[PDB]
């Protein structure tokens, strides 16, 4: 087409979606990771994770307001990945990289799994 | 912080949100612009438009599944802006620029109003 494009639009949209999350505006699901609860927007979770895309395209699961993750999932790992979904920034540290990588494999977030593998390889 | 950032994340999120819109997945509102209807995600509309941000943060209006816009709004202008919200690309043409600018002023999309003003000034 003959369209023009606003370079910062996608980043500005994501920043506003994170502001809605902060302010608990139009959040429509609670993700439970053992004793912790995380509120989020189903559409953002689906846009970032192959697991959530599969869950919320299922005719029965799309209607649930609570999703319980596997008990082996670490809440801190999930929190770091949820922050990444809404900001593009990943808080990867020596002390959390194994939990983050395991959580990203479970959530099916291939680009995160890729950077974790590279950071682990560099330490070996 | 000491975060790393994935450059293409925000663009990839927006592309996936547009794929959900295409496939009518988790759309939760219909915007009516005279005889036409447009399905969308309330969160994307709020992230892009000051008018939708005000509508869906209102305690009564946040619960509506149908929103009727002012009858003076042009459906083609709205369609072009809705496509911009989900893609960052604006289909601005000599034949639609006045309707697009008027619609962006109504929807409170300041960056779009800015580029329309500049393109109009260049033609004068």
């Amino acid at each position: 087409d003959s369209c023009i494009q606003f370079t910062r639009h996608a980043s500005d949209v994501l920043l506003n979606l994170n502001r809605l999350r902060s302010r608990d505006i139009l959040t429509d699901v609670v993700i439970v990771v053992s004793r912790e609860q995380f509120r989020a927007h189903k559409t953002v979770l689906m846009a970032c994770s192959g697991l959530f895309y599969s869950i919320f395209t299922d005719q029965l699961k799309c209607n649930l307001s609570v999703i319980n993750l596997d008990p082996e999932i670490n809440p801190e790992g999930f929190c770091i990945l949820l922050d990444f979904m809404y900001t593009s920034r990943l808080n990867l540290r020596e002390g959390n990289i194994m939990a983050v990588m395991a959580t990203a494999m479970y959530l099916q977030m291939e680009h995160v799994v890729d950077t974790c593998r590279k950071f682990i390889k560099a330490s070996e | 912080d000491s975060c790393i950032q994935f450059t293409r994340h925000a663009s990839d999120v927006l592309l996936n949100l547009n794929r959900l819109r295409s496939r009518d997945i988790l759309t939760d509102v219909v915007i009516v612009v005279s005889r036409e209807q447009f399905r969308a995600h309330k969160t994307v509309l709020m992230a892009c438009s000051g008018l939708f941000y005000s509508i869906f943060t209102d305690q009564l209006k946040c619960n509506l599944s149908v929103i009727n816009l002012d009858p003076e709004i042009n459906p083609e202008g709205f369609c072009i802006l809705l496509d911009f919200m989900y893609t960052s690309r604006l289909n601005l043409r000599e034949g639609n620029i006045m309707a697009v600018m008027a619609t962006a002023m109504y929807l409170q999309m300041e960056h779009v109003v800015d580029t329309c003003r500049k393109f109009i000034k260049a033609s004068e």
């Binding site: 023009i4 494009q5 | 604006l90």
Partner: peptide, 4 residues
């Protein structure tokens, strides 16, 4: 704004 740019030409994509």
């Amino acid at each position: 704004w740019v030409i994509p």
